[PDB]
């Protein structure tokens, strides 16, 4: 399993130790408070009132937790995933990323605490 | 495992399929948007700005997801719990409840989608 912190101001995101392999089933739990700029903070589903002005993930709100698996597009994580299976031909290291507009991460604050495990399969 | 909706206006909470037994390891993932009254909605960690005016759980924010295990007091769930073990004084059915002030649930809206499963032990 993997446990770590994902900083809101980290544009590259955090590469985890989890390699998603064909047939894997995974569980993610995310917690904590972060901001894309305002003094207010939001949880891992982000801010449902903020418009999308070029977010790295168009399927999640600004300030949501998202991920990439290998060279995949962004995949929403939000509060987490329960016994979840990846699309076919999605594989590789899981990177966790805060959902914001590229080049606008500098003013972000806080972080999410994230657990990832492989489930029985 | 169990999956279901926990309504914010359900003062009694939702009894799940899960009987927490001594030594059980469980994972909970909670998602969605709910309100304790305002038109604004919050995730399963609730509203980090709202004072505690007599919440059923003093250890979580107003509008957070909490639970009881059998005849236990409230235990914070928030976004969820990863491979979590209860203290050995707690057993029985898990009831999921929205964190609000007793008698003030009538005006609540929205719900959380929750998954609970037992892990290897
Ligand atoms: O595969 C999914 C996916 C994401 C979250 C879920 O809760 C789920 O059941 C499936 C997916 C969703 C959005 C997206 O842009 C890409 C994805 O692969
Ligand atoms: O474990 C508890 C807990 C709460 C009520 C009980 O009757 C009990 O036997 C145990 C707990 C309480 C507060 C908290 O913030 C986290 C907890 O796990
Ligand atoms: Ca920003
Ligand atoms: Ca209320």
From Swiss-Prot, chains A, B:
It is found in: Cytoplasm; Periplasm; Cell surface. GO terms for cellular component: cell surface; cytoplasm; periplasmic space. SUPFAM superfamilies: Galactose-binding domain-like. InterPro entries: Galactose-bd-like_sf (IPR008979), PA-IL (IPR012905). Gene3D superfamilies: Galactose-binding lectin. Its main location: cytoplasm. The keyword Chaperone does not apply. Keywords: Cytoplasm, Lectin, Periplasm. One of its GO terms (biological process) is heterophilic cell-cell adhesion via plasma membrane cell adhesion molecules. Pfam families: PA-IL. GO terms for molecular function: carbohydrate binding. Belongs to the LecA/PllA lectin family. D-galactose specific lectin. Binds in decreasing order of affinity: melibiose, methyl-alpha-D-galactoside, D-galactose, methyl-beta-D-galactoside, N-acetyl-D-galactosamine. Similar to plant lectins in its selective (carbohydrate-specific) hemagglutinating activity. This is PA-I galactophilic lectin. It comes from Pseudomonas aeruginosa (strain ATCC 15692 / DSM 22644 / CIP 104116 / JCM 14847 / LMG 12228 / 1C / PRS 101 / PAO1).
């Amino acid at each position: 399993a993997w446990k770590g912190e994902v900083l809101a101001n980290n544009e590259a995101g955090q590469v985890t130790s989890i390699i998603y392999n064909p047939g894997d089933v995974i569980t993610i739990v995310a917690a904590g408070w972060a901001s894309y700029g305002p003094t207010q903070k939001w949880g891992p589903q982000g801010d449902r009132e903020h418009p999308d002005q070029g977010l790295i993930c168009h399927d999640a709100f600004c300030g949501a937790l998202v991920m990439k698996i290998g060279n995949s597009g962004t995949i929403p994580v939000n509060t987490g995933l329960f016994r979840w299976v990846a699309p076919n031909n999605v594989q590789g290291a899981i990177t966790l990323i805060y959902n914001d507009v590229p080049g606008t991460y500098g003013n972000n604050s806080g972080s999410f605490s994230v657990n990832i495990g492989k489930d029985q399969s």
